[PDB]
Amino acid sequence: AKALTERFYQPKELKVMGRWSVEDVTVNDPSLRPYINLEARLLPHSHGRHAKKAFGKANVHIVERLINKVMRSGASSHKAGGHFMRREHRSLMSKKMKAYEVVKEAFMIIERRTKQNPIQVLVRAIENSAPREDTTTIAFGGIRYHMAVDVSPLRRLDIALKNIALGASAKCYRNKTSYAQALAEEIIAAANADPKSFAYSRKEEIERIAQSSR
Amino acid sequence: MKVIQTAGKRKTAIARATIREGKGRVRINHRPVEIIEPEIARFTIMEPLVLAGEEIVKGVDIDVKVEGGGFMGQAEAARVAIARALVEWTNDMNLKEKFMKYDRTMLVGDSRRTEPHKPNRSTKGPRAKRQK
Amino acid sequence: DEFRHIVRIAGVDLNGNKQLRWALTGIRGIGINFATMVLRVAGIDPYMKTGYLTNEQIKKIEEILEDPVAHGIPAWAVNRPKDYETGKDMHLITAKLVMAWREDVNRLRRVRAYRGIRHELGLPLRGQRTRSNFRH
Amino acid sequence: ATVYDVPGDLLVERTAKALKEVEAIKPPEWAPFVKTGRHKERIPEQEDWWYYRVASIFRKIYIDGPVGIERLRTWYGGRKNRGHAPEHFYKAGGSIIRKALQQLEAAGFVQKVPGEGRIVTPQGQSFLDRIATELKKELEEQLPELKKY
Amino acid sequence: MSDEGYPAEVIEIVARTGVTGGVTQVKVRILEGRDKGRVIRRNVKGPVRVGDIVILRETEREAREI
Amino acid sequence: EFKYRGYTFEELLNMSLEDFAKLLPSRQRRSLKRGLSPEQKKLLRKIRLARKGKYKKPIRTHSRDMVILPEMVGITIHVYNGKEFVPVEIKEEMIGHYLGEFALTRKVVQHGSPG
Amino acid sequence: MQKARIKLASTDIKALNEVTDQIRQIAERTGVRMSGPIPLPTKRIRITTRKSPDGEGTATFDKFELRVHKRLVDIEADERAMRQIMRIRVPEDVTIEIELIS
RNA sequence: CCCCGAAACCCCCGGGCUACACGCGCGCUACAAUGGGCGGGACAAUGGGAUCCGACCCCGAAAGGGGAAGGGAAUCCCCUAAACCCGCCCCCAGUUCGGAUCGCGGGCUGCAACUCGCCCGCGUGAAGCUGGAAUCCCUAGUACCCGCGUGUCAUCAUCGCGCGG
Ligand SMILES: [Mg+2]
Ligand SMILES: [Mg+2]
Ligand SMILES: [Mg+2]
């Protein structure tokens, strides 16, 4: 950054990025509470070490999961905003340093706004962006019915983070707004639970489709 | 002149740290950690220091020579080397356990290496394949 | 004051009010490199905007364009070095440029060379293949 | 204080500004023209790029010692857009760095080992370390964890 | 935002389900509301371990299967 | 009226090979400075004689890589295209070109319908 | 006293070891100071052919490899030692080279 | 086995296999800000080298040119990689995106560069603003992204085999 103290920021306290603490952070959804890691972890970066196991994601910090979802490249095999995005070389895939700075600028943004811990804001956003029921087709005696099902909290997290990031991506695509700004907007919008957020909207639609399916 | 040598490895990156009594100066290839330009690399290297605390760092001086692959690998190898240096300088197992529960790979190494590339579109990867 | 949303440089090729070097690339025969050269030799700021250009500055870069090498431009940075009728190394602008292209082309045609033939048939002539990827 | 103690880019710009006060650091007549390499696409957009470049070279010779023009060429090179074709690395031109080194040998900052390239002189390392200690102070108003060093 | 959802703790995994194997039938026990101990069998999507907590928009559906 | 590089054809003739080369483009200059092949030299001396003498014959050749010169002007050369010796009456404005540029090998395509 | 480098290279670690043991036991038979069999990086000549003549079918490759193990031994140059290390058998699949540092 | 057998054998010159109204496969570059340019700052590994690598010096705007230490290979060289970071311009548009095409000139290889090579500089400034139906690859240091080496090689790498980030 252009302040030289943000450029050579030195950590001292083991806050997250040496800037934001998590002791004051609380998650009121009990199904997500175990699966949301909020340890005093200075650097979110893990080096893949969790994926080889089945719930290392549970053991993994949450802002790390965010930046990893932000290392995105848009949507290649699906259509967010009705559009394939397909950034190929000008993406952030495998660029976690860029992703880290994107997330950090987003947090700084919202905290300039929102007068709140941005991690608190983020947990609120995934909470009210995370669905509870989905639908899937099951066979009973050989005949398929699009039944409704409940969603496991890990999968709820996965969806929430994914579609937060995807909304940010669609809003930053081919327009004047930055990825960080789109991300900030998406998180606070979802936390306020307004439909402007792609993520809240998507949660509501899969949920109303489920409550239609049963 | 009590000095202690430690070493760290992270995928084609080798750091050699020497630790001794001093003031708190810690240098990576003649350069202060304070000014290492990617924040992430700085933070990888600093984690053991923050975690161990100023109380002992301020009496320690460290110098790391790292001669390998990438900035991140170098940072991790340095992190390893200085973590081991602190532990072997202090003989504090409460600190060893603090590190081992924060990140075990801080003291044990990451054993991972790159998988050899295999024929079909070998330049891309061992499993990356041509299109049908 | 001294503002102009539009400016004529080298006739009435008329240029916006962005920074001057790119405004000049708005001319045929001028890229950003030749532009930066011309301005550096004429003492003008390239980052400057065109609205604040004075008529004498206009005249100055116009005369440079008229005879670049005489002003400090090298001979290896020009549209038309070692011309086919005067060994002078010169830089050509819009109309003289299309005319020069036309002339060398139809010279080749007059002598019925491969390039002239391939020009008049509108096909590639710089070694390409044309089988799979030249389809119009 | 020293070069290794402070960062690079800030030092290069500061010592360039200071090198403008040296008379043996005139740009050559072909500077306002030419690119820095075939790997580039456009002329330098700055007017003092010559001083920035010789400052950089001076620091590089401080750090890497008996080094010459081909090594510096590969450091000042980089990636080229080769059109529709993929990207590759290309070295830079040698004339810029040669003229720079020669200007510096004139000013007294580098000398020329008969073999194995060029080497900074005491007056040269003094110059650089002076600028570095100055800079270190000005950013020790900031980081006292760097006052330490 | 958290509407009238009812927590439910997972006590036992049973066979997996789904045309493509993504679903897992499971036995769960409600924790709050009026049941406060009524086990029930639900078809849950995604990874589950025992001790997990799934929250339900209702409790009177009770899919059953072998 | 023709003026290759500010030089008229008389001057081009009275010139040597070195200076004409200096006037030529880089490729043809390189060809000359590297020197001619024996077949090229034999062709060239045939041409000298034909401007003089008569040579008692038309000039034929397989050499498509011989660059034209002012001496090779006012003359008709028959160049092999692979199948035929095709005639090339050499004007002043072929001055620094190869014979093959005027002797063509592949005839133009007039396509039939796909199938 | 001036020293003698013995660079020896083979495809068989056991022949190589045989030679080095010959040298060790002969130096200690005498008393001249050995410098160990320093093992140098072994050369892996790799040749990756396609194993098909036809050009048809899936492309499959044979990665053939030749390995050259290399040792060097420094021993002080005496006429005795030199005569007898010349007398050494030096089996067929090995090369040696006695340079002298002086 | 049949055939050619003084031609269907051998060698040389030239052309062609590089033609192009079109259909298809695999890929490269892009359609920009999850960026472009300029200047600065960083960090590799694998492999290879005798008429071969060539530091280092000088000349040149570049490509390149002259001389040349050392190196038959853990000694020397190829070899200070790019993606990344910092600052400054550009601020959502067929643009400071994109680089098809073409003109002029300057070079290297070679016996020969037109057909038909590769490189550099000035100039030009093509479609393309995310892509239907349908389809491919992939489970961890993997995929994606980044560049490098080598084989082919007189000169030619959007390829193959490999290397690391
Ligand atoms: Mg461009
Ligand atoms: Mg657009
Ligand atoms: Mg091939």
XYZ file of N, CA and C in Angstrom, chain D residues 3-124:
366
model
N 23.041 -1.207 2.274
C 22.150 -1.527 1.185
C 21.265 -2.688 1.546
N 21.835 -3.715 2.151
C 21.047 -4.846 2.573
C 20.073 -4.483 3.670
N 20.359 -3.442 4.435
C 19.476 -3.049 5.509
C 18.233 -2.354 5.009
N 18.346 -1.530 3.978
C 17.149 -0.887 3.433
C 16.592 -1.615 2.218
N 15.397 -1.258 1.753
C 14.868 -1.874 0.537
C 15.530 -1.359 -0.723
N 15.124 -1.941 -1.845
C 15.809 -1.691 -3.094
C 15.241 -0.537 -3.888
N 13.946 -0.585 -4.184
C 13.326 0.392 -5.071
C 13.465 1.814 -4.551
N 13.198 2.015 -3.266
C 13.361 3.325 -2.658
C 14.787 3.808 -2.771
N 15.731 2.910 -2.547
C 17.128 3.274 -2.625
C 17.509 3.678 -4.029
N 17.030 2.936 -5.015
C 17.343 3.232 -6.397
C 16.826 4.602 -6.778
N 15.592 4.921 -6.410
C 15.099 6.241 -6.778
C 15.849 7.356 -6.067
N 16.166 7.169 -4.794
C 16.886 8.193 -4.064
C 18.279 8.403 -4.635
N 18.991 7.324 -4.921
C 20.334 7.464 -5.443
C 20.342 7.923 -6.884
N 19.268 7.707 -7.623
C 19.148 8.328 -8.923
C 19.058 9.827 -8.807
N 18.154 10.283 -7.962
C 18.018 11.700 -7.711
C 19.350 12.308 -7.326
N 20.141 11.573 -6.565
C 21.454 12.054 -6.184
C 22.473 11.975 -7.300
N 22.337 11.018 -8.194
C 23.233 10.859 -9.317
C 23.051 11.923 -10.357
N 21.909 12.591 -10.362
C 21.718 13.732 -11.238
C 22.703 14.848 -10.944
N 23.258 14.863 -9.745
C 24.238 15.850 -9.353
C 25.655 15.452 -9.718
N 25.827 14.333 -10.398
C 27.112 13.894 -10.907
C 27.176 14.215 -12.389
N 28.310 14.745 -12.825
C 28.461 15.221 -14.186
C 28.809 14.126 -15.173
N 29.400 13.037 -14.721
C 29.700 11.930 -15.603
C 28.525 11.023 -15.841
N 27.322 11.451 -15.492
C 26.125 10.654 -15.691
C 25.203 11.366 -16.656
N 25.767 11.883 -17.722
C 24.962 12.401 -18.801
C 24.335 11.248 -19.573
N 23.071 11.362 -19.966
C 22.514 10.384 -20.868
C 23.113 10.503 -22.254
N 23.175 9.424 -22.990
C 23.570 9.529 -24.387
C 22.468 10.043 -25.277
N 22.883 10.515 -26.438
C 21.988 11.160 -27.369
C 20.887 10.250 -27.882
N 21.016 8.943 -27.708
C 20.018 8.006 -28.183
C 19.102 7.509 -27.084
N 19.167 8.096 -25.909
C 18.301 7.716 -24.815
C 16.824 8.023 -25.036
N 16.447 9.248 -25.410
C 15.018 9.568 -25.537
C 14.268 8.679 -26.495
N 14.987 8.076 -27.401
C 14.596 7.050 -28.337
C 14.663 5.736 -27.588
N 15.266 4.740 -28.203
C 15.268 3.320 -27.883
C 14.650 2.814 -26.594
N 13.999 1.668 -26.734
C 13.613 0.801 -25.644
C 14.821 0.261 -24.903
N 14.531 -0.382 -23.790
C 15.522 -1.042 -22.975
C 15.804 -2.467 -23.413
N 15.004 -3.022 -24.309
C 15.260 -4.356 -24.798
C 14.273 -4.750 -25.866
N 14.618 -5.822 -26.577
C 13.689 -6.392 -27.541
C 12.464 -6.953 -26.863
N 12.582 -7.289 -25.590
C 11.462 -7.842 -24.862
C 10.421 -6.784 -24.556
N 10.773 -5.519 -24.701
C 9.839 -4.446 -24.472
C 9.081 -4.080 -25.735
N 7.996 -3.356 -25.517
C 7.089 -2.911 -26.554
C 7.111 -1.416 -26.787
N 7.437 -0.629 -25.771
C 7.294 0.809 -25.815
C 8.512 1.486 -25.217
N 8.728 2.716 -25.660
C 9.806 3.542 -25.127
C 9.570 3.759 -23.648
N 10.602 3.969 -22.847
C 10.369 4.430 -21.490
C 9.577 5.719 -21.478
N 8.638 5.792 -20.554
C 7.733 6.919 -20.478
C 8.307 8.049 -19.647
N 9.431 7.814 -18.989
C 10.048 8.816 -18.152
C 11.241 9.444 -18.839
N 11.638 10.599 -18.331
C 12.763 11.339 -18.862
C 14.057 11.026 -18.130
N 13.972 10.605 -16.875
C 15.122 10.345 -16.023
C 15.382 8.848 -15.885
N 14.848 8.078 -16.827
C 15.022 6.642 -16.794
C 16.475 6.250 -16.870
N 17.305 7.086 -17.470
C 18.712 6.776 -17.551
C 19.318 6.719 -16.168
N 19.025 7.720 -15.358
C 19.532 7.765 -14.008
C 18.971 6.645 -13.165
N 17.705 6.305 -13.359
C 17.157 5.171 -12.632
C 17.888 3.886 -12.981
N 18.236 3.730 -14.246
C 18.891 2.525 -14.721
C 20.323 2.420 -14.221
N 21.054 3.524 -14.201
C 22.421 3.441 -13.720
C 22.452 3.300 -12.219
N 21.483 3.870 -11.525
C 21.366 3.639 -10.101
C 21.154 2.170 -9.795
N 20.232 1.555 -10.517
C 19.991 0.134 -10.376
C 21.247 -0.674 -10.636
N 21.974 -0.342 -11.694
C 23.172 -1.084 -12.041
C 24.220 -0.940 -10.961
N 24.352 0.261 -10.431
C 25.298 0.532 -9.371
C 25.015 -0.338 -8.160
N 23.763 -0.381 -7.744
C 23.395 -1.240 -6.638
C 23.638 -2.708 -6.938
N 23.332 -3.141 -8.147
C 23.548 -4.529 -8.502
C 25.011 -4.897 -8.434
N 25.884 -3.960 -8.775
C 27.311 -4.203 -8.721
C 27.833 -4.175 -7.302
N 27.263 -3.334 -6.451
C 27.503 -3.453 -5.023
C 27.244 -4.871 -4.565
N 26.057 -5.374 -4.866
C 25.637 -6.637 -4.284
C 26.361 -7.792 -4.937
N 26.059 -8.046 -6.194
C 26.813 -8.993 -6.977
C 28.063 -8.290 -7.463
N 29.188 -8.935 -7.257
C 30.434 -8.235 -7.269
C 31.014 -8.287 -8.650
N 31.949 -9.156 -8.871
C 32.566 -9.193 -10.187
C 31.583 -9.697 -11.223
N 30.728 -8.793 -11.686
C 29.689 -9.089 -12.658
C 29.886 -8.215 -13.884
N 29.397 -8.699 -15.024
C 29.496 -8.000 -16.280
C 28.191 -7.874 -17.040
N 28.343 -7.483 -18.301
C 27.232 -6.990 -19.096
C 26.239 -8.085 -19.424
N 26.685 -9.298 -19.709
C 25.732 -10.346 -20.036
C 24.871 -10.766 -18.855
N 25.462 -10.915 -17.682
C 24.705 -11.127 -16.465
C 23.694 -10.010 -16.227
N 24.124 -8.760 -16.329
C 23.175 -7.672 -16.157
C 22.112 -7.664 -17.240
N 22.454 -8.121 -18.431
C 21.495 -8.186 -19.518
C 20.377 -9.140 -19.182
N 20.731 -10.312 -18.697
C 19.696 -11.239 -18.291
C 18.936 -10.757 -17.073
N 19.514 -9.891 -16.244
C 18.683 -9.369 -15.170
C 17.733 -8.274 -15.622
N 18.137 -7.464 -16.575
C 17.305 -6.384 -17.061
C 16.370 -6.815 -18.169
N 16.461 -8.058 -18.603
C 15.542 -8.602 -19.567
C 14.193 -8.934 -18.995
N 13.494 -9.798 -19.715
C 12.190 -10.223 -19.270
C 11.359 -10.792 -20.391
N 10.062 -10.796 -20.144
C 9.106 -11.467 -20.999
C 8.680 -10.592 -22.163
N 8.451 -11.229 -23.303
C 8.015 -10.567 -24.516
C 6.662 -11.112 -24.924
N 5.779 -10.220 -25.355
C 4.584 -10.622 -26.080
C 4.988 -10.878 -27.520
N 4.962 -12.142 -27.913
C 5.408 -12.552 -29.235
C 4.226 -12.748 -30.160
N 3.216 -11.947 -29.921
C 2.049 -11.973 -30.753
C 1.085 -13.044 -30.349
N 0.554 -13.721 -31.355
C -0.240 -14.918 -31.176
C 0.559 -16.060 -30.587
N 1.851 -15.967 -30.614
C 2.716 -17.003 -30.118
C 2.932 -16.861 -28.618
N 3.285 -17.945 -27.944
C 3.480 -17.876 -26.503
C 4.668 -17.023 -26.111
N 4.766 -16.811 -24.813
C 5.683 -15.849 -24.247
C 6.982 -16.520 -23.843
N 8.078 -15.794 -24.021
C 9.399 -16.284 -23.688
C 10.195 -15.155 -23.070
N 11.356 -15.508 -22.548
C 12.250 -14.576 -21.894
C 13.305 -14.138 -22.883
N 13.578 -12.847 -22.897
C 14.604 -12.301 -23.746
C 15.428 -11.324 -22.942
N 16.718 -11.354 -23.215
C 17.650 -10.426 -22.628
C 17.486 -9.034 -23.202
N 18.095 -8.092 -22.513
C 18.059 -6.706 -22.890
C 19.272 -6.336 -23.728
N 19.222 -5.130 -24.268
C 20.359 -4.575 -24.945
C 21.501 -4.275 -24.008
N 22.689 -4.351 -24.579
C 23.905 -4.168 -23.841
C 24.443 -2.761 -23.822
N 24.029 -1.940 -24.775
C 24.612 -0.620 -24.906
C 24.247 0.281 -23.745
N 23.028 0.165 -23.241
C 22.609 0.970 -22.107
C 23.494 0.683 -20.913
N 23.648 -0.588 -20.592
C 24.349 -0.955 -19.382
C 25.835 -0.740 -19.541
N 26.366 -0.947 -20.737
C 27.763 -0.652 -20.999
C 28.066 0.823 -20.815
N 27.293 1.693 -21.450
C 27.504 3.118 -21.290
C 27.348 3.541 -19.847
N 26.424 2.918 -19.136
C 26.262 3.197 -17.724
C 27.497 2.833 -16.929
N 27.983 1.617 -17.114
C 29.166 1.155 -16.415
C 30.352 2.040 -16.708
N 30.455 2.499 -17.934
C 31.554 3.353 -18.311
C 31.441 4.730 -17.692
N 30.231 5.258 -17.615
C 29.988 6.500 -16.904
C 30.354 6.382 -15.444
N 30.034 5.251 -14.846
C 30.321 5.039 -13.444
C 31.802 4.879 -13.192
N 32.509 4.220 -14.095
C 33.951 4.139 -13.967
C 34.586 5.502 -14.124
N 34.000 6.352 -14.953
C 34.467 7.722 -15.053
C 34.245 8.484 -13.758
N 33.055 8.386 -13.185
C 32.731 9.075 -11.945
C 33.463 8.526 -10.736
N 33.935 7.296 -10.797
C 34.768 6.755 -9.766
C 34.133 5.716 -8.897
N 33.009 5.172 -9.307
C 32.213 4.340 -8.439
C 32.421 2.868 -8.690
N 32.795 2.506 -9.903
C 33.115 1.134 -10.240
C 34.439 1.113 -10.973
N 35.136 0.013 -10.818
C 36.319 -0.308 -11.572
C 36.101 -1.633 -12.267
N 37.064 -1.987 -13.088
C 36.904 -3.016 -14.094
C 38.024 -4.018 -13.895
N 37.736 -5.075 -13.148
C 38.704 -6.157 -13.005
C 38.996 -6.717 -14.390
N 40.265 -6.997 -14.744
C 40.582 -7.416 -16.117
C 39.719 -8.563 -16.599
N 39.601 -9.579 -15.757
C 38.587 -10.591 -15.910
C 37.484 -10.343 -14.906
N 36.487 -11.224 -14.943
C 35.384 -11.268 -13.982
C 34.857 -9.870 -13.646
N 34.507 -9.159 -14.690
C 33.621 -8.022 -14.596
C 34.080 -6.834 -13.776
N 33.084 -6.177 -13.198
C 33.237 -4.867 -12.597
C 32.844 -4.885 -11.137
N 33.514 -4.031 -10.388
C 33.595 -4.098 -8.945
C 33.415 -2.696 -8.412
N 32.652 -2.572 -7.344
C 32.410 -1.258 -6.789
C 33.648 -0.775 -6.047
N 33.882 0.524 -6.100
C 35.006 1.143 -5.421
C 34.615 1.590 -4.028
N 35.597 1.937 -3.199
C 35.262 2.447 -1.868
C 34.420 3.701 -1.899
N 34.754 4.651 -2.763
C 33.934 5.846 -2.888
C 32.532 5.494 -3.352
N 32.406 4.437 -4.144
C 31.095 4.018 -4.590
C 30.255 3.423 -3.482
